[PDB]
Structure 1
Amino acid sequence: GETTDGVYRVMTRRLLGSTQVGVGVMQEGVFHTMWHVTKGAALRSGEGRLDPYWGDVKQDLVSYCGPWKLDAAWDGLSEVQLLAVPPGERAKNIQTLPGIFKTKDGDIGAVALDYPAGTSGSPILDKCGRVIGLYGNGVVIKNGSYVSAITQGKRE
């Protein structure tokens, strides 16, 4: 079905009404989303079918129709934009300066923006519009607020 580049909502009819369980990015004929959104299950795009190609529970990422294509990275200095696609609400760009997740295996960018769980998979962009990662896997800090990692995959 539809393979035009852009941000897409991930929906389900298994529960009451139509529910948005996540978001994803279509780029170079590949759909990129977070693993906890689809659990690696097949997706539908109109009459067409999208089968998983690559996935990883630890990275919390999954690609459909082909290998992961997103490889732009945060520069460690500039502000970024979360193209938040919230459930039942219009796509909206939110500008922020990312923080840092310091891990035993290096530092990762982090966006401190609080959105519904069905917003997971929303792309984070640089000033060029390039997807530097996905919003939706992070931690809930002491004051009850949410902080997500800027999760980026590897382009083979």
Structure 2
Amino acid sequence: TTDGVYRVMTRGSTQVGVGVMQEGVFHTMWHVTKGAALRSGEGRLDPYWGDVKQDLVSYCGPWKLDAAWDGLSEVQLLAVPPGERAKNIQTLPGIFKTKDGDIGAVALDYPAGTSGSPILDKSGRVIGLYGNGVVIGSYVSAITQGKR
């Protein structure tokens, strides 16, 4: 239940994604868990809210992350790749231009089990999650943020 970034594992064992614990709520991407319940030690985390179009899911309570990219500054992907220590990758986002407005996007291509890794602003706030995007050979991830 401790705040932090967590691996999402499945059973040998395989890392299928990553997520964020904040304010007692676990945040990850829908395509990582498909809403399935999660084990944490001897406890169980049940889904609370999910949305396929946003590709997000929260466990134990409502989505808590609400910071947003400022459109100008560099950010950091706190990548947690399978088999690797959590590590910070700094980058200037590009932009997904959509009919509904602009979304920050990071042109960083890490293994699929990194999906759900948080993207951070300079203050350490989570401005979204990594792992839903498009290909241009190079993958580009939206900075996917929910609504609090």
Bin of the TM-score, shorter chain as denominator length: over 0.9
SS of the residue 1:147 aligns to: strand
**Which residue in 2 is equivalent to 1:151?**
144
Q: Tell me how far apart the structure 1 counterparts of residues 109 and 33 of structure 2 sit (CA, whole Å).
A: 21
Partners of 1:20 and 1:139 in 2: CA distance: 22
Q: Secondary structure at the match of 1:62?
A: strand
Q: Report the counterpart of residue 96 of structure 2 in structure 1.
A: 101
Q: Any idea what the Cα deviations from partners look like across 1:69-113, whole Å, max 9, x if unmatched?
A: 000000000000000000011100000000000011111000000
d(CA) in 1 for partners of 2:138, 2:72: 23
Secondary structure in structure 1 of the residue aligned to 2:61: coil
State the Cα distance separating 1:48 from its structure 2 match.
0.2
Deviation at 1:127, TM superposition (A): 0.5
Deviation at 1:135, TM superposition (A): 0.3
2:36 is paired with a residue of what secondary structure? coil
Q: What's the % identity of the aligned pairs? A: 99
SS in 1 for 2:109: coil
Inter-partner Cα distance in structure 1 for 2:105 and 2:141? 6
Q: CA deviation at 1:36?
A: 0.1
TM-score w.r.t. structure 2 length? Answer: 0.99
Deviations 1:121-151 (A, max 9, x none): 000000000000000000111xx11100000
- Alpha-carbon distance in structure 2 between the residues aligned to 1:121 and 1:148: 11
Q: 1:87 & 1:145 partners in 2: Cα distance?
A: 20
| Structure-1 separation of matches of 2:100 and 2:126 | 23
CA distance in 1 between partners of 2:25 and 2:93 (Å): 27
- Listed as ranges, the matches of 1:82-101 within 5 Å are 82-101=77-96
3-state SS of paired residue (2:26) = strand
Distance 1:107 1:96 in 2: 18
Give secondary structure in 2 for the equivalent of 1:70.
Answer: coil
Aligned length: 147
CA distance in structure 2 between the partners assigned to 1:103 and 1:130 by the alignment: 24
For 1:84 and 1:129, how far apart are their aligned partners in 2? 14
Tell me by how many angstroms 1:54 deviates.
Answer: 0.3
Unpaired stretches in structure 2, ≥5 consecutive residues: none
Structure 1 portions without partners, runs of 5+: none
Runs of 4+ residues deviating >6 angstroms: none
Q: TM-score, normalised by structure 1?
A: 0.94
